[model samples]
Each structure stands twice: as structure tokens, then as C-alpha cells.
Target: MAQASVVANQLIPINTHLTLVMMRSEVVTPVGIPAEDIPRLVSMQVNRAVPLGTTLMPDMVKGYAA
Candidate 1:
């Protein structure tokens, strides 16, 4: 999971500031990977992961889709 941590460190700086309310749900890991892969998996989850309480609107256009 070192790779995952490195990615998180380089990326998700806001992760450190996330409130408990901001992180309310667990992400589902896709099948077929090592258990040690969970950190990487969970980290992956956090990266693309959107919480239920968030207000998101989808548009037909995009500059970049997060």
C-alpha cells in the first residue's frame, strides 16, 4: 500500500481536513485483489469516492470530469 500512500500524500491533502461527517460511508472494493491491497483499494475508493451527502449535478458537457 506504499504506492497508495504515496499517491495520497501527493494528492488528497484535503483528506487530512475531512470531517467525520464528510466521511460517512464505506466504499466497496472490486473483486480479486490481495487483502494487503485494501489500503490501496480504500485509497482508490477515497480518490473517486463521493459521499452521499454531497450535492452533485451532472452536466452534458465537461472540461474535465472528476
Candidate 2:
């Protein structure tokens, strides 16, 4: 998860023509957070699901900005 976080942090930059969309089970979109907060989220979930831990997994987090 650390590696994933590093990669995500590096690839995603501030004001860099990037779009991050997050969806939960029923919400589909989490409210009250800025777009930049998505990476912290992504890293957390990825890390949780590795070898021994159990965590919630979403359907998808991929899409191009329109």
C-alpha cells in the first residue's frame, strides 16, 4: 500500500489537469471532501486489503475527465 500510495502521490499533482472520482456502496460519491483528498483515501483502502487485513472494496475508481 505504501508503494501504491507513493505512486499515486507522484502521479497525481496539484492543479495538474487531473480528475479523481470516488464512489461508495450506496453513496456513489462521498461528500464534503475536496478532489485532492481522494489519494489519501485510495492508499488507505489499498493498504487495508493486502495480505491479512479486511477492508471495504469499491467497484471502480477509474474514468477519464470530460
Q: In terms of lDDT, which candidate is strongest? A: 2
TM-score of 1: 0.20
Worst 10 residues of 2 by lDDT: 1-10
Would you give me the overall lDDT of model 2? 0.27
Write the residue-wise lDDT of candidate 1 on 1-66 in tens digits.
121111121222322332323322222332222223323333222324333433211221122133
Model 1 alpha-carbon drift over 4 Å, by segment? 1-16, 30-66
The per-residue C-alpha lDDT of model 2 at residue 1 equals 13
- Scored by CA lDDT, what does every candidate get? 0.26, 0.27
Model 2: residues with Cα > 4 Å off, grouped in runs: 1-31, 43-66
By summed lDDT, which 10 consecutive residues of candidate 1 come out lowest?
1-10
Residue 8's C-alpha lDDT in candidate 2? 30
Model 2 vs. true fold: TM = 0.20
Clashes of each: 0, 0
